Design a protein around this ligand. Structure first.
Ligand SMILES: NNC(=O)c1[nH]c2ccc(S(N)(=O)=O)cc2c1-c1ccccc1
Ligand SMILES: [Hg+2]
Ligand SMILES: [Zn+2]
Length: 256
């Protein structure tokens, strides 16, 4: 099935998922001199104080930290969004080297990794229904650069040993996603898609200008993960990022 390798990677995806060549695919390059400040944007509201993490899973592509979304506990609202979007999970995309790994790029600049906090529009009842709607999802994207360690990330880093291979999961309760945010909530926003198959065009992307810094040892542990299942030949989980897709005269707006 689909992956990130030469034989199942991003330019093979269109065969099983024709929408890969669609009109609002993600990620995209953010050309900072083409993005326009939008005064009609409300401030962004990230309410993660009552977030309830459930567990962490290696899905053979990346790892997901999953949250209980059966109540309004961790919500995204404001900015370009109408109504309330509930946090369901977060995950990352990263490279084999610090000079690559992010999915969105900024004036062609690739970051070492990208964090995606995935939220679904609560007017649709559940995630499965939300992904059938053009405004079903909101993904908050945060760039990672290598520098000082991010203390709020370390609990995630520590558990990765326990979920090395495809299909492995571990209890991951009481994780506070507030520890992953940069200071500034300045952002760019554009309408887009899932960056993974089925590549559904259901996403309002909100990409934060300010990156977080993570340590070299933190990222190195990400790179120790496996794409393969236990007992299979080792295929390191690295370069699990889709490259930038045609903007196709969508408009990227800036909050600042
Ligand atoms: N990880 N399992 C999933 O079902 C999944 N759901 C997603 C929703 C949104 C996005 S996104 N990257 O465009 O923010 C990704 C996912 C995923 C997923 C994420 C990483 C690897 C494989 C699947
Ligand atoms: Hg959709
Ligand atoms: Zn993602």
């Amino acid at each position: 099935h689909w992956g990130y390798g030469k034989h199942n990677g991003p330019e093979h995806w269109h065969k099983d998922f024709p929408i890969a060549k669609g009109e609002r695919q993600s990620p995209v390059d953010i050309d900072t001199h083409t993005a326009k400040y939008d005064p009609s944007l409300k401030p962004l509201s990230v309410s993660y104080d009552q977030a309830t993490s459930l567990r962490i899973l290696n899905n053979g592509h990346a790892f997901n930290v999953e949250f209980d979304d059966s109540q309004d506990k961790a919500v995204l609202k404001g900015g370009p969004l109408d109504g309330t979007y509930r946090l369901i999970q977060f995950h990352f995309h990263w490279g084999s080297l610090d000079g690559q790994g992010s999915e969105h790029t900024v004036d062609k600049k690739k970051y070492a990794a990208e964090l995606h906090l995935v939220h679904w529009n609560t007017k649709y009842g559940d995630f499965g229904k939300a992904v059938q709607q053009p405004d079903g999802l909101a993904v908050l994207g945060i760039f990672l650069k290598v520098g000082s360690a991010k203390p709020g990330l370390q609990k995630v880093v520590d558990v990765l040993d326990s979920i090395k291979t495809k299909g492995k999961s571990a209890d991951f309760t009481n994780f506070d996603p507030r520890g992953l945010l940069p200071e500034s909530l300045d952002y760019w926003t554009y309408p887009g898609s899932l960056t993974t198959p089925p590549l559904l065009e259901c996403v309002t992307w909100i990409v934060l200008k300010e990156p977080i810094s993570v340590s070299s040892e933190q990222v190195l542990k990400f790179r120790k993960l496996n794409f393969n299942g236990e007992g299979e030949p080792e295929e390191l989980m690295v370069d699990n990022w889709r490259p930038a897709q045609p903007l196709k005269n969508r408009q990227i707006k800036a909050s600042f």
